[PDB]
Design an enzyme around this catalytic site. Structure first.
Site, mmCIF file in Angstrom:
data_model
loop_
_atom_site.group_PDB
_atom_site.id
_atom_site.type_symbol
_atom_site.label_atom_id
_atom_site.label_comp_id
_atom_site.label_asym_id
_atom_site.label_seq_id
_atom_site.Cartn_x
_atom_site.Cartn_y
_atom_site.Cartn_z
ATOM 1 N N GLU A 34 0.850 -1.181 0.000
ATOM 2 C CA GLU A 34 0.000 0.000 0.000
ATOM 3 C C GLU A 34 0.889 1.236 0.000
ATOM 4 O OE1 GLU A 34 -1.839 0.083 4.554
ATOM 5 O OE2 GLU A 34 -2.637 -1.338 3.084
ATOM 6 N N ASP A 45 -4.006 9.557 10.241
ATOM 7 C CA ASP A 45 -2.585 9.253 10.296
ATOM 8 C C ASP A 45 -1.930 9.940 11.483
ATOM 9 O OD1 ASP A 45 -1.449 7.500 8.146
ATOM 10 O OD2 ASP A 45 -2.658 8.848 6.877
HETATM 11 O O1 LIG Z 1 1.325 0.302 11.200
HETATM 12 P P1 LIG Z 1 0.747 1.685 11.011
HETATM 13 O O2 LIG Z 1 0.102 2.143 12.297
HETATM 14 O O3 LIG Z 1 1.773 2.750 10.705
HETATM 15 O O4 LIG Z 1 -0.273 1.633 9.747
HETATM 16 C C1 LIG Z 1 0.120 2.262 8.533
HETATM 17 C C2 LIG Z 1 -1.092 2.788 7.761
HETATM 18 O O5 LIG Z 1 -0.889 4.060 7.144
HETATM 19 C C3 LIG Z 1 -1.549 1.712 6.776
HETATM 20 O O6 LIG Z 1 -1.180 0.466 7.318
#
Ligand SMILES: O=P(O)(O)OC[C@@H](O)CO
Ligand SMILES: *Cc1c(COP(=O)(O)O)cnc(C)c1O
Lengths: 241, 416
Positions: A34, A45
């Site tokens: 992704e 975020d």
């Molecule tokens: O593991 P994280 O908390 O950084 O999750 C990232 C997101 O932007 C998508 O997984």
């Protein structure tokens, strides 16, 4: 086996280091990529991914996506907020499709656009793109069950309100709540950076893990090699199931 | 007598639509969501985001609940029905029975327990009227912790009785805007006569806790609070069951929304009752003039953005009104439920609620909180509609507190 879904901000930290990291991620066990499209408002975020968007400010993403696509065989999901594109949704999706991306994950689709779920999911599927639908404990049990029947590739379930920030939360209990509702593969994410936090979700029923912030942190602290390292570690853990 | 629930109920998993999550503001200089881990006791924060339908009430908390008189009484107001010549039956869950005089104790008790269990030894919070300040001072006393209350300045001056009780339990009470926080002095700089607001007092409480490494207890708005309050609605169902009764109309008053969601959500989630009426002030028209947007619970903006009906974080309440329900926003879950049409809302003005209270004083006997007289007021209007419809409607409402420390308010309302 289990799905390791790796997130990275497009162009981060720079175009050639990003390419480096991606290639290393894919070679070391990433099943899905992704890739973040710098939004106007990274609503859900945390500070680490928000800062990573600032660093790549100005990036021309399309030629870059075409470079990545050329070599990477794995599915690639564009990740960005629907609010920034809803007024140009058809052209956006058509450009995502032009540069040969597999699908899209609109984190704010269900949460801020629930009344258009069916319409927008048709538009996406109609163009031959995978619509990876995003859910969390904020989504009611019935709706989770419904979108689990239509989400493409997997259903995403974020256990914390915002990426990166390690909110105290019982992952084991949130997965049990939803495991029997999700008639899909169930990929868990948001703050899964510790083996313990990661092994908890696997053994509770999750079919995969999504990880992003810890890679950016790694790239910033020790660099891209040291971060591709981390992928190997995480792939190993998922491989124990 | 274990009508007292074994679990807290969270409606979120049963909502009609998704509940937008708390949120860092766009391009913020610091993460509010990350700051929560300093503001709130760890386990309070965990309950705020580990959303499950049911969450066991720790046995020590159930024991404390019992010791303050839970389950609260479920009274039938037969004299009141006769006075209204209504065919409806009228019941009320009497949250005024707890030692503090309101339902706020239901969340102060667990929050304080969790803080004491984490090693906290000083808690902080704001209060307007003083119902929440008093709850927190009692709860802190229960667990041998110090408490600092930031009280809205104008209330601090007109309500010395509540200050006495808070100080009696061992709390220190300041009048926000104070000059003990950065945000306090800022507000004093621009207008040193400022009478304060729940939003301003909330922010100083939070700032003061951070500056001193204390913890902050939250009295309304957030889901963890309405989760804790679901003891109210669960007992009511059990208590109606014991009577072979089935609620038709459920009525509650709404400041931030905790007593309403504690009372009605167990009814809404399981599909019991039909018609939920959240009642508010016309002088603080959250519902009629409010706006459904992401906005800060506090005025400084130290908590995350939250999606709620709000008059705006920097709302300042009317200068002369004495009826309460002055907070500027509605809990996100309640905001969702009323925007989605599941809950009805209703606003009343001071004279209407003051008359409602006198009716209740004169035909039931308990002096109600000015807040609760908003609910009483809707109870009375519905009892009359059940008349001109002739149906045995059962109207259950939540009498969220007594008014014994609000007699200065009732005197003020002799001006109508
Ligand atoms: O593991 P994280 O908390 O950084 O999750 C990232 C997101 O932007 C998508 O997984
Ligand atoms: C604080 C209070 C209210 C309003 O707050 P809610 O969160 O809606 O409960 C209502 N009644 C009483 C007695 C209160 O103290």
């Amino acid at each position: 086996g289990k799905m390791l879904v790796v997130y990275m901000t497009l162009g981060y930290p720079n175009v050639q280091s990003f390419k480096d990291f991606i290639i290393g991620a894919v070679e070391n066990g990433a099943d899905i990529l992704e890739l973040g499209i710098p939004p106007k408002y990274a609503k859900y975020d945390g500070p680490v991914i928000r800062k990573s968007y600032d660093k790549v400010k100005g990036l021309d993403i399309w030629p870059l996506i075409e470079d990545i696509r050329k070599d990477v065989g794995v599915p690639i999901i564009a990740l960005t907020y629907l609010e920034d594109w809803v007024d140009q949704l058809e052209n956006f999706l058509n450009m995502i499709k032009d540069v040969k991306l597999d699908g899209i994950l609109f984190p704010d689709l269900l949460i801020d656009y629930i009344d258009d779920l069916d319409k927008i999911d048709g538009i996406i599927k109609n163009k031959g793109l995978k619509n990876v639908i995003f859910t969390s404990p904020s989504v009611p049990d019935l709706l989770i069950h419904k979108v689990s029947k239509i989400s493409d590739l997997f259903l995403y379930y974020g256990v914390r309100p915002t990426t990166g920030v390690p909110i105290p939360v019982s992952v084991k209990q949130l997965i049990n709540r939803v495991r029997n509702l999700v008639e899909n593969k169930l990929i868990v994410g948001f703050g899964l950076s510790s083996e313990s936090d990661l092994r908890d979700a696997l053994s509770a029923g999750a079919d995969g893990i999504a990880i992003g912030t810890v890679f950016i942190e790694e790239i910033e602290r020790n660099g891209v090699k040291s971060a591709i390292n981390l992928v190997k570690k995480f792939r190993a853990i998922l491989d124990e199931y | 007598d274990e009508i007292l629930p074994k679990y807290w109920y969270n409606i979120i998993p049963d909502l009609p639509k998704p509940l937008p999550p708390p949120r860092d503001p766009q391009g913020a200089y610091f993460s509010r969501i990350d700051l929560l881990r300093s503001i709130l006791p760890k386990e309070v924060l965990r309950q705020q985001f580990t959303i499950e339908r049911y969450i066991k009430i720790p046995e020590e908390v159930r024991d404390r609940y019992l010791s303050i008189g839970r389950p609260t009484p479920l009274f039938r107001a037969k004299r009141l029905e006769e006075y209204l010549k209504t065919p409806a039956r009228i019941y009320f869950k009497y949250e005024g029975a707890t030692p503090t005089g309101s339902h706020k104790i239901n969340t102060a008790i667990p929050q304080a327990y969790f803080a004491k269990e984490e090693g906290i030894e000083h808690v902080v919070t704001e209060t307007g009227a003083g119902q929440w300040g008093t709850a927190v001072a009692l709860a802190a006393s229960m667990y041998n912790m110090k408490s600092t209350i930031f009280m809205v300045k104008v209330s601090y001056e007109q309500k010395p009785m509540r200050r006495s009780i808070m100080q009696l339990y061992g709390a220190n009470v300041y009048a926000s805007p104070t000059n003990l926080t950065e945000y306090g002095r800022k507000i004093l700089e621009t207008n040193p006569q400022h009478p304060g607001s729940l939003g301003i007092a909330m922010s100083e409480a939070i700032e003061y806790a951070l500056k001193n490494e204390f913890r902050y207890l939250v009295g309304s708005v957030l889901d963890v609070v309405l989760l804790h309050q679901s003891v109210i609605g669960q007992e009511t169902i059990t208590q109606l069951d014991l009577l072979g009764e089935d609620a038709d109309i459920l009525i509650g008053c709404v400041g931030g929304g905790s007593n309403f969601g504690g009372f009605t959500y167990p009814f809404i989630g399981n599909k019991k009752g039909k018609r939920y009426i959240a009642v508010s002030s016309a002088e603080i028209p959250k519902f009629s003039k409010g706006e459904y947007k992401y906005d800060f619970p506090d005025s400084a903006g130290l908590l995350p953005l939250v999606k709620m009906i709000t008059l705006g974080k920097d709302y300042v309440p009317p200068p002369i009104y004495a009826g309460g329900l002055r907070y500027h926003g509605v809990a996100p879950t309640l905001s969702l439920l009323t925007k989605e049409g599941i809950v009805e809302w209703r606003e009343y003005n001071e004279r209407e609620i003051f008359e409602a209270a006198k009716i209740f004083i004169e035909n039931q006997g308990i002096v109600p909180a000015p807040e609760s007289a908003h609910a009483i007021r809707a109870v009375v209007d519905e009892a009359i509609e059940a008349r001109k419809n002739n149906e045995r409607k059962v109207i259950v409402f939540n009498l969220s507190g007594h008014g014994l420390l609000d007699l200065s308010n009732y005197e003020s309302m002799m001006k109508r």
